[PDB]
Design a protein around this ligand. Structure first.
Ligand SMILES: CC(=O)CSCCNC(=O)CCNC(=O)[C@H](O)C(C)(C)COP(=O)(O)OP(=O)(O)OC[C@H]1O[C@@H](n2cnc3c(N)ncnc32)[C@H](O)[C@@H]1OP(=O)(O)O
Ligand SMILES: Nc1ncnc2c1ncn2[C@@H]1O[C@H](COP(=O)(O)OP(=O)(O)OP(=O)(O)O)[C@@H](O)[C@H]1O
Ligand SMILES: C/C1=C/C(=O)O[C@@H]2C[C@@H](CC[C@H](C)/C=C\CC1)O[C@@](O)([C@@H]1CSC(=O)N1)C2
Ligand SMILES: [Ca+2]
Lengths: 167, 138, 367
């Protein structure tokens, strides 16, 4: 799966003209209401969560992944919705997406990536992930919301993989 | 023994305190988490919980093992409900916690959540243990 | 997949607000009405469509005084909210609903049943409206005075938990004030009497009315000059003038006898609510009296509350009336906050819990 295309990794909220293409990509794989899918991508911001797009100049949305911060783990990020466009799979773009996530997250001081999966566990072990224990991701909140916020006892009664990787 | 019930109620880590208290005849703590609050409940505190005056503790509050609490909901003497919801009171900004008391045929079941645990989780947990004990005629 | 944002639906007597948890404003604000032909596409018309066709419809409010009274029509409102106003699929989103204080027991069970059985929500929660408004003010303890279109509530809240024993209800709110302004405008020589004319008067009320700090003094000022008179231009270009009606109308909040009601004003019921509460929290209630609802938008209402509460409360007591700027939508904003908190994950009623425990699960988990 040697990869030959020139690719960049850019947040959706900096290329809003590509948000609709990114919704197409994700809904093709995991269909749900486009209203909801467009709103989720519209949450992307530098504060996290943010949606990264793997882009090709000649522009095509090759892939996407969502990064979210983790409750009580400042150096962790939760990776979700990892998908490469269906027609472009098997060309190395999935590896480069996950590797680009590591570079992006590490440049910002994060040291640990977390994600769930069932059917693609071997894809993640192949890229260096191993089994971990669960984490809770921090959802989007708008900047504008406040943010201040003796008888004997009777008898008693009687799946996904969590992957992590240090970066 | 009854301590197995404290173990059971404490297993999932949501609560910091739990106890089973007999309220008939002379009340006494049948089982409780050692070194916490409920283990120190007095007969007088039991008497207020199950008593006829269901109005004074709204303005005066009540205590459980000496910890002052505020009454949120009181259904402790109502059939089908048999639960009371409270929140502890603190001084100097120290955190407060949600409490639920349920009333069976012979016991009061008390649960105190850890910090941040929602009272609905505590209420449901206490209600299910009480239902299990009523079904056993306890 | 991304795990998806929760929906926040605030259902009021007059207006419904719907949007996504985490947003700072609802995506949809539409009237809580169902319309039927007085004497066509449908047997029924809902929300903005009923509004559009109101000329040929009799309008009904499924929510009276904050309480659902017509469940078939409320189901229509929720169907309109999900599929027409938000254009989402309800089975894909956790749903946060709001309820009026003291919402009857059977109503909140039925609310739960409809969300899970009819709309197949994967998870849901029910929050008291006043509590959400307190969250939007950046607080968890205090007393909220929520006056909307159909009901006014005073709701003391401790650490986010409403204290029902001290909740007081006043069947007097914005729609009654509009009705009153219609009446005293007629007594000024005009004729506002129809449903359509009523909507115009509502706009007059929202644009020109205010709360006087000293009502008797203000009546005297109005009788001795024209400095308080304003003009309002009707749709046909005709112009009316309004004087002491500007402040006589909202004065009914403080003097419900203006509407023929033998009921305490909002200031005095706020006070009675506080005196029903734990001795140890009254100081904080007095210092965190929060106004919410569209009927609290009148200029001067906070000052008037400050003065009236001060007269009733001990001379030592510190009294603070907070009027957040977005209080017309604080209930919804508060639900956006709550449904976005890390904690809120544990609070949902899941579809599985509902299958195990039935609708009465709402009584154990939502308070
Ligand atoms: C975190 C979550 O969102 C939940 S887990 C869901 C992961 N996403 C999906 O399942 C969506 C459908 N699938 C896709 O979008 C793509 O297949 C994904 C899985 C995102 C990326 O993979 P692809 O683009 O198709 O493969 P590709 O990068 O070309 O291959 C990278 C290496 O990973 C291996 N690979 C690809 N799919 C694999 C797989 N299912 N299992 C094991 N290995 C896999 C390839 O052999 C390749 O090995 P190497 O030659 O580089 O050493
Ligand atoms: N600027 C304003 N000044 C005065 N009143 C206003 C203003 N804006 C809106 N209102 C009034 O507020 C009312 C609607 O407020 P809100 O949406 O809080 O009530 P609701 O939630 O629909 O009903 P309720 O809460 O009583 O069940 C209407 O009566 C409307 O006329
Ligand atoms: C702009 C607006 C304000 C409002 O609060 O509107 C709500 C909902 C409305 C429903 C009927 C109306 C014809 C449809 C839409 C008006 C919505 O009734 C109200 O205006 C009622 C009638 S008069 C009054 O003051 N409250 C309140
Ligand atoms: Ca309301």
């Amino acid at each position: 799966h040697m990869s030959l295309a020139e690719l960049t990794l850019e947040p959706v909220h900096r290329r809003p003209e590509l948000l609709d293409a990114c919704a197409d990509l994700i809904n093709d794989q995991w269909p749900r209401s486009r209203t909801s899918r467009l709103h989720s991508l519209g949450q992307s911001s530098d504060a996290f969560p943010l949606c990264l797009m793997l882009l090709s100049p000649h522009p095509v949305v090759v892939g996407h992944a969502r990064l979210s911060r983790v409750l009580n783990q400042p150096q962790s990020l939760l990776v979700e919705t990892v998908v490469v466009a269906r027609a472009l799979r098997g060309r190395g773009f999935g590896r480069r997406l996950m590797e680009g996530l590591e570079v992006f997250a590490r440049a910002r001081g994060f040291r640990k990536l977390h994600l769930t999966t069932h059917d693609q566990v071997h894809f993640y072990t192949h890229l260096g992930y191993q089994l971990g224990e669960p984490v809770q991701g921090l959802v989007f909140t708008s900047r504008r919301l406040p943010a201040t916020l003796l008888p004997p006892p009777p008898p008693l009664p009687e799946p996904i993989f969590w992957m992590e990787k240090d970066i | 023994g009854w301590n197995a019930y404290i173990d059971n109620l404490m297993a999932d880590g949501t609560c910091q305190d739990a106890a089973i208290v007999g309220y008939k005849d002379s009340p006494s703590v049948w089982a409780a988490v050692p070194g916490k609050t409920f283990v120190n409940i007095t007969p007088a505190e039991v008497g207020v919980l199950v008593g006829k005056d269901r109005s004074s503790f709204y303005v005066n509050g009540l205590t459980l093992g000496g910890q002052k609490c505020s009454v949120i909901r009181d259904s402790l003497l109502q059939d089908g409900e048999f639960s009371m919801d409270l929140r502890t009171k603190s001084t100097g900004g120290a955190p407060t916690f949600n409490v639920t008391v349920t009333k069976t045929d012979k016991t009061l079941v008390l649960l105190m959540g850890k910090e941040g645990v929602h009272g609905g989780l505590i209420n449901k947990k206490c209600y299910e243990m009480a239902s299990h004990l009523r079904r056993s005629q306890y | 997949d991304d795990d998806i944002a929760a929906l926040v639906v605030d259902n009021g007597s007059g207006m419904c607000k719907a949007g996504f948890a985490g947003d700072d404003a609802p995506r949809a604000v539409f009237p809580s009405i169902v319309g039927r032909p007085r004497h066509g596409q449908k047997d029924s018309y809902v929300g903005d469509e009923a509004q559009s066709k109101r000329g040929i419809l009799t309008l009904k409010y499924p929510i009276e005084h904050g309480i659902v009274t017509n469940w078939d029509d409320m189901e229509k409102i929720w169907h309109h909210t999900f599929y027409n106003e938000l254009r989402v699929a309800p089975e894909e989103h956790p749903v946060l609903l709001t309820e009026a204080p003291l919402n009857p027991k059977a109503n909140r069970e039925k609310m739960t049943q409809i969300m899970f059985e009819t709309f197949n929500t994967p998870a849901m929660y029910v929050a008291i409206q006043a509590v959400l408004s307190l969250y939007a003010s950046g607080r968890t303890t205090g007393i909220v005075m929520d006056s909307g279109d159909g009901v006014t509530h005073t709701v003391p809240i401790y650490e986010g938990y409403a204290l029902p024993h001290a909740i007081l209800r006043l069947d007097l709110a914005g729609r009654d004030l509009t009705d009153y302004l219609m009446k005293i405008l007629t007594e000024r020589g005009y004729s506002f009497t129809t449903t359509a004319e009523r909507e115009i008067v509502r706009d007059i009320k929202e644009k020109l009315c205010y709360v006087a700090l000293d009502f008797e003094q203000e009546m005297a000022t109005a009788a001795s000059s024209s400095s308080l008179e304003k003009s309002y231009e009707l749709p046909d270009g005709q112009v009316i003038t309004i004087g002491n009606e500007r402040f006589r109308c909202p004065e009914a909040l403080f003097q419900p006898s203006f509407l023929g009601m033998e009921s305490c004003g909002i200031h005095e019921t706020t006070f009675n609510s506080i005196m029903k509460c734990d001795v140890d929290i009254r100081k904080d209630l007095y210092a965190n009296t929060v106004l919410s609802g569209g009927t609290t938008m009148y200029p001067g209402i906070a000052d008037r509350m400050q003065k009236e509460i001060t007269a009733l409360a001990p001379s030592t007591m510190k009294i603070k009336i907070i009027a957040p700027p977005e209080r017309k939508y604080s209930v919804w904003i508060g639900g956006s906050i709550l449904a976005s908190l890390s904690t809120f994950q544990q609070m949902w009623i899941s579809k599985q819990e509902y299958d195990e425990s039935g609708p009465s699960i709402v009584h154990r988990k939502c308070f």
